Each structure stands twice: as structure tokens, then as C-alpha cells.
Amino acid sequence: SMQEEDTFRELRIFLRNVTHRLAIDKRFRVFTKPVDPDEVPDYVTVIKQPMDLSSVISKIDLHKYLTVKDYLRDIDLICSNALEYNPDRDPGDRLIRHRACALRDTAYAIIKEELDEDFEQLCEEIQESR
Ligand SMILES: C[C@H]1CCCN(S(=O)(=O)c2cc(NC(=O)CN3C(=O)CNC3=O)ccc2Br)C1
């Protein structure tokens, strides 16, 4: 219905606002663009499911997220890909991992303060009903 379409439009508006606030954080610049295949050849071979904030924006716009749960799966993938590809003890890898965990914690904390649980629950019930 029109009412359900209004619900998903509000969700996309919410998800773009949260994603924008992550993307302008200087700590998360590395997560704003896909890994450039030129600069990093073995990324696409090692990370099976690349994800970054530019892809999250594209997915919002293609209506790929019907719930904040589904969006947070992609935030969690940006973090787990970073931990997976940069696992070493050296400062380079420890910095990326620290940033990856801060992106995940910041997204979860924004949503905890600003997502109405009844709004999420409506999104889940419309999604389940399809
Ligand atoms: C090859 C690794 C270097 C450290 C960052 N990781 S990552 O897995 O945390 C990751 C990166 C990007 N995007 C970029 O690194 C984009 N980029 C370049 O490729 C060169 N400069 C630049 O900013 C996106 C998501 C993740 Br999870 C990739």
C-alpha cells in the first residue's frame, strides 16, 4: 500500500542520514569507497563480499534494505572484511581494525539512540508479509 511505501521511504531517509554521518567521519574515509583493484589486486580474490559506504548508499537507493537489521548486516560486513583482510599486529592493520570497530560501534550507537523500535518492528512485519 501507499502507507507501506511511506514506511520504506522513511526507512531509506533514515539510512541515508546515518550513512552520511558515518561517511563524513575522517576516521572512516577508508570505508567510503570500494578497495581500488589497481592499488590492491588480491582484495576481490580474498574478500568474497566487498562492502563499503558508497555501496551502502547505492543499495539504499535500489530499495535493497527493508529493515535496519538488513542495513546493519552490511555495516557488520564492512567491519568483518576489515578485520579479516588486515589481521596483523603491525600498526597499519591495528589502526584499520580499530577504525572498522569504531564505524560498527558508531552505526549501532546512532541507531540505538534514534531508531524507534516500533518503526523497526513495522518494517520487519511488512518484510515478513512478502
Ligand atoms: C586493502 C585494504 C587497505 C586498508 C583498508 N581495507 S578495508 O578492508 O578496511 C576496506 C577498504 C575500503 N576502501 C578503500 O580502502 C579505498 N581506498 C583504496 O583502495 C585506496 N585508497 C582508498 O581510500 C572499503 C571497505 C573496506 Br572493509 C582495504
UniProtKB/Swiss-Prot annotation:
May be a transcriptional coactivator of the nuclear receptor ESR1 required to induce the expression of a subset of estradiol target genes, such as CCND1, MYC and E2F1. May play a role in the recruitment or occupancy of CREBBP at some ESR1 target gene promoters. May be required for histone hyperacetylation. Involved in the estrogen-induced cell proliferation and cell cycle progression of breast cancer cells. Residues 108-130 form a coiled coil. Interacts with ESR1 and NCOA3 and these interactions are enhanced by estradiol. Interacts with acetylated lysine residues on histone H1.4, H2A, H2B and H3 (in vitro). Belongs to the AAA ATPase family. It comes from Homo sapiens (Human). It is found in: Nucleus. Residues 3-114 form the Bromo domain. This is ATPase family AAA domain-containing protein 2. Highly expressed in estrogen receptor positive breast tumors and in osteosarcoma tumors. The chain holds residues 981 to 1108 of 1390 of the full protein. Induction: Up-regulated in breast, uterus, colon, ovary, and stomach tumors. Induced in breast cancer cells overexpressing NCOA3 or treated with estrogen. Down-regulated in 5-fluorouracil-resistant derivatives of the colon cancer cell line HCT 116.
